[PDB]
């Protein structure tokens, strides 16, 4: 799968609108498992279930544990660039 970089716009009150699985301890990439309707990832239209999150705003998540990826992702604000590939 070709790498894509996708920008989403998040207001402060809302989450990213995704569920993720995986991470280093699981021996698989951080994977989008759900796209929540009406939330930023859905509104932006470039992120899909089955996409691996390789990086976010230039933070490499290829080798991060699940919880650390969650924390990094949950810290992002405003306009947020995802580097993703469909697995």
């Amino acid at each position: 799968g070709p790498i894509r970089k996708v920008l989403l716009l998040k207001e402060d009150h809302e989450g990213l609108g995704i569920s993720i699985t995986g991470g280093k301890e699981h021996g698989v990439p951080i994977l989008i498992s759900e796209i929540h309707p009406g939330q930023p990832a859905d509104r932006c239209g470039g992120l899909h279930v089955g996409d691996a999150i390789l990086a976010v705003n230039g933070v490499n998540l290829r080798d991060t544990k699940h919880k650390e990826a969650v924390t990094i992702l949950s810290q992002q604000r405003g306009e947020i660039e995802f580097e993703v590939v469909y697995v």
Binding site: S19, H26, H66
Partner: peptide, 7 residues
């Protein structure tokens, strides 16, 4: 026994 987090 599966890790899934909503974000």
């Amino acid at each position: 026994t599966r890790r899934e987090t909503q974000l």
